[PDB]
Amino acid sequence: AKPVWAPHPTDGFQVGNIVDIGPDSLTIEPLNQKGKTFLALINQVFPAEEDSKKDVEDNCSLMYLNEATLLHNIKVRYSKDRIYTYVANILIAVNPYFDIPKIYSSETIKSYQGKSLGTMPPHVFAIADKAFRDMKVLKLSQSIIVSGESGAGKTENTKFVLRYLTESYGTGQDIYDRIVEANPLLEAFGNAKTVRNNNSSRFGKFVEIHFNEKSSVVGGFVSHYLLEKSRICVQGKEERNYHIFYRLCAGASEDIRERLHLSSPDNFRYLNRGCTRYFANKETDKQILQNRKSPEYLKAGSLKDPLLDDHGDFIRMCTAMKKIGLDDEEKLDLFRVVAGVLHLGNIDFEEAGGCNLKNKSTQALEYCAELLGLDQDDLRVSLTTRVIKVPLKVEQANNARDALAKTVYSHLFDHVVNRVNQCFPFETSSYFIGVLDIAGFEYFEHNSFEQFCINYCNEKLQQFFNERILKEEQELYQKEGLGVNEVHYVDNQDCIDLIEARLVGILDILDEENRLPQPSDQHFTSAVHQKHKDHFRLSIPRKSKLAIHRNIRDDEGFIIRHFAGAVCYETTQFVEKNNDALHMSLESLICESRDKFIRELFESFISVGNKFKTQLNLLLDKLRSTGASFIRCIKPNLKMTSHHFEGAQILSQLQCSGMVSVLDLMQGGFPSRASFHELYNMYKKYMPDKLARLDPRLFCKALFKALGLNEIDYKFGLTKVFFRPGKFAEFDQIMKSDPDHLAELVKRVNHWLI
Numbered sequence: 001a002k003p004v005w006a007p008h009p010t011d012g013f014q015v016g017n018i019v020d021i022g023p024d025s026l027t028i029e030p031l032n033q034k035g036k037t038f039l040a041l042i043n044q045v046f047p048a049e050e051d052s053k054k055d056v057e058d059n060c061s062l063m064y065l066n067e068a069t070l071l072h073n074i075k076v077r078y079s080k081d082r083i084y085t086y087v088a089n090i091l092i093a094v095n096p097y098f099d100i101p102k103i104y105s106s107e108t109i110k111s112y113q114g115k116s117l118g119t120m121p122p123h124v125f126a127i128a129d130k131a132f133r134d135m136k137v138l139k140l141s142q143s144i145i146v147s148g149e150s151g152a153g154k155t156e157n158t159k160f161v162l163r164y165l166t167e168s169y170g171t172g173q174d175i176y177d178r179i180v181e182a183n184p185l186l187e188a189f190g191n192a193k194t195v196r197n198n199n200s201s202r203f204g205k206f207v208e209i210h211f212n213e214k215s216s217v218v219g220g221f222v223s224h225y226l227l228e229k230s231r232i233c234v235q236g237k238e239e240r241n242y243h244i245f246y247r248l249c250a251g252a253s254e255d256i257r258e259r260l261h262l263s264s265p266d267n268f269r270y271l272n273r274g275c276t277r278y279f280a281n282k283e284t285d286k287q288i289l290q291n292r293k294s295p296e297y298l299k300a301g302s303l304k305d306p307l308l309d310d311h312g313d314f315i316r317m318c319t320a321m322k323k324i325g326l327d328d329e330e331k332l333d334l335f336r337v338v339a340g341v342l343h344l345g346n347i348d349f350e351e352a353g354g355c356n357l358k359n360k361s362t363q364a365l366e367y368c369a370e371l372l373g374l375d376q377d378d379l380r381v382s383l384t385t386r387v388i389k390v391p392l393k394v395e396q397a398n399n400a401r402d403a404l405a406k407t408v409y410s411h412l413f414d415h416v417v418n419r420v421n422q423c424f425p426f427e428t429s430s431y432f433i434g435v436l437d438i439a440g441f442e443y444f445e446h447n448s449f450e451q452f453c454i455n456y457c458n459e460k461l462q463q464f465f466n467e468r469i470l471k472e473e474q475e476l477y478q479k480e481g482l483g484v485n486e487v488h489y490v491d492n493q494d495c496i497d498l499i500e501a502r503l504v505g506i507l508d509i510l511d512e513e514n515r516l517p518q519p520s521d522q523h524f525t526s527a528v529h530q531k532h533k534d535h536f537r538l539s540i541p542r543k544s545k546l547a548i549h550r551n552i553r554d555d556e557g558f559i560i561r562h563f564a565g566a567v568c569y570e571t572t573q574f575v576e577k578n579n580d581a582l583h584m585s586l587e588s589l590i591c592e593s594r595d596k597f598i599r600e601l602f603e604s605f606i607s608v609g610n611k612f613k614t615q616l617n618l619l620l621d622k623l624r625s626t627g628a629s630f631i632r633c634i635k636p637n638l639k640m641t642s643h644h645f646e647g648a649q650i651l652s653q654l655q656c657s658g659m660v661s662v663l664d665l666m667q668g669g670f671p672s673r674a675s676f677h678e679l680y681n682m683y684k685k686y687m688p689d690k691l692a693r694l695d696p697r698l699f700c701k702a703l704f705k706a707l708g709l710n711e712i713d714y715k716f717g718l719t720k721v722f723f724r725p726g727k728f729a730e731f732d733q734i735m736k737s738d739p740d741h742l743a744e745l746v747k748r749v750n751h752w753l754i
């Protein structure tokens with residue numbers, strides 16, 4: 001028979017032949033497993049490409065456009081170490097989990113410069129170049145949105161884009177060294193090992209590269225969002241604090257180790273609940289001194305990763321600081337605060353006749369106060385009392401200590417981002433190309449406010465993609481009278497409203513709890529379920545598909561049905577985590593440090609959730625004002641391994657990211673377009689009298705023919721002319737404004753009229 005695609009539980013789809021049809025279902029015979037059959041629904045079976053070994057660079061070029069052929073085409077490419085594949089002018093990128101030779105080389109960079117989409121193989125570099133060309137030609141700033149769940153490859157692709165644009169369109173080694181070599185610094189302070197990603201970003205960023213009128217790089221600017229705070233003090237056993245702690249412990253000279261009073265990570269509360277092992281290989285393990293290694297490292301050996309290496313990354317980070325222009329004083333200032341936070345965490349309290357510092361904590365107190373430029377008694381007092389003085393219980397002292405740790409580290413991070421921005425400043429610019437790299441969709445056995453905020457942000461980003469690519473695109477077709485078949489899809493605005501709505505949204509209900517005389521997580525949680533009974537996007541934990549979640553009580557958690565999947569959150573500590581305010585007692589202490597660096601870090605209730613919403617909406621305003629390009633990163637498996645394509649997991653991402661819906665729309669859609677009037681007028685200037693007499697519509701048809709299009713490749717709308725997928729190269733030639741180019745084509749067409 002003719003082979004079709006039919007469901008498979010782990011592969012997503014499998015190859016088979018239809019061997020019966022009935023009023024209720026079909027009967028499929030899996031290829032090669034003849035005699036065996038299974039039933040499938042008619043609506044679940046798809047036509048397959050005749051050649052199962054070939055692949056296409058643009059999925060729109062498939063004979064059959066559907067989720068099954070999309071999946072297979074990406075799979076074949078992935079098997080040949082081609083991680084990049086288009087859907088029209090959108091890029092899908094599947095994490096290879098290893099370094100594929102040469103594909104990011106300076107030679108490869110040069111080969112993408114000025115090349116139209118489709119004239120070179122799919123690549124993150126082509127997306128970057130197209131953003132650059134639109135900026136230069138349309139005179140419009142550009143955003144490149146890199147989406148995907150945790151570990152899918154957003155950060156690595158963001159970095160490829162930045163390297164490409166700076167190496168291609170920035171003059172000198174300097175501006176490259178500055179924008180690119182700034183990255184090891186941000187990652188040291190803002191990235192950490194989670195169970196999904198050894199190099200997980202725990203903050204979001206929008207990095208703008210700014211250009212002058214001549215489209216040459218003049219500088220950069222990084223905006224950062226919502227560093228994860230809880231991580232600073234505690235991690236789960238398979239996770240780590242921010243990389244900087246481990247890089248410093250493994251890599252610092254003896255002189256620096258002594259001065260900062262560092263030791264192996266098992267020695268610090270703020271590291272020792274987490275994995276205390278270093279990333280290292282056989283060689284680099286030899287370069288780490290024995291006195292830096294925890295008992296767990298000594299027993300279990302190092303963590304393995306093809307990229308991360310704590311000792312090697314320390315050295316690389318130090319080299320980075322030098323290259324961008326941090327002096328040694330600035331470096332040591334950074335390290336001193338990092339150490340101060342570590343010693344801060346080692347301070348213990350015991351019930352007094354209030355509470356006191358345990359006798360064993362005297363040293364930690366001395367080291368902390370020293371490193372942060374504080375008087376020991378002031379510090380002791382601020383941790384054990386509050387304001388008329390009031391003595392604190394041990395639990396309260398623990399919280400005060402940790403709150404100070406979190407605020408100090410967070411201000412340190414703010415300084416790092418600012419200092420990076422000061423490495424590539426600019427007074428003015430004409431346009432920018434910005435790249436968005438957020439912390440991606442994630443969930444674990446236990447999900448808290450951190451995951452809730454991250455997933456909320458991912459929800460908002462996916463809504464932007466929907467708004468731009470699925471909603472506005474179709475409204476454009478409609479407005480222009482193209483008669484493109486409407487593609488319906490599940491929108492996630494209702495999910496956003498559940499979280500965001502004034503007064504009754506989850507964030508506002510949380511704020512309300514914070515402002516109550518006796519704030520309670522259980523009270524907040526009940527109010528949410530109460531106000532949103534029968535909301536499609538909200539469930540009580542016992543309804544979870546996973547046994548681990550069902551034991552959670554109704555007022556102890558909730559399930560949000562995110563666009564990317566249901567996530568069950570434990571709501572314990574939501575109220576605490578929602579308050580960004582720091583006690584003035586603690587603030588003044590740090591503000592009045594004897595140390596200038598410490599003071600400069602710092603220049604009842606503040607809603608973390610609503611501060612975040614506000615910052616994200618400002619970001620979204622900026623995105624809306626730009627031309628937007630999209631790279632959809634895909635995580636191939638849950639094991640961080642190479643050449644292990646989990647078809648069902650990948651299909652699920654293709655569906656929820658909207659790529660299946662976009663592929664559908666591209667069956668009759670038109671990804672390129674331009675104003676007819678403007679297009680005609682551009683050529684009109686050069687037209688001999690006979691050609692200028694020619695009907696403008698007829699001229700355009702002749703132009704398109706001359707530049708290689710068939711009538712099915714384009715379509716005139718009311719005011720714009722539209723072009724099909726796969727025709728970007730011809731579109732670009734048609735739109736080319738170079739006076740020499742214009743003249744030649746005008747000559748050619750006017751010749752037909754003799």
Ligand SMILES: Nc1ncnc2c1ncn2[C@@H]1O[C@H](COP(=O)(O)OP(=O)(O)O)[C@@H](O)[C@H]1O
Binds near residue numbers: 083095099151155306
């Ligand atoms: N194109 C790529 N080439 C090589 N390794 C990659 C690529 N993309 C991702 N990786 C690997 O996968 C890991 C996670 O990718 P990353 O971009 O950090 O994920 P996220 O989407 O969470 O930012 C990286 O640390 C690196 O090991």
Ligand code: VO4
Binds near residue numbers: 155200438441
């Ligand atoms: O693991 V990532 O947070 O950087 O999406």
Ligand SMILES: [Mg+2]
Binds near residue numbers: 154155156199201439
């Ligand atoms: Mg990342």
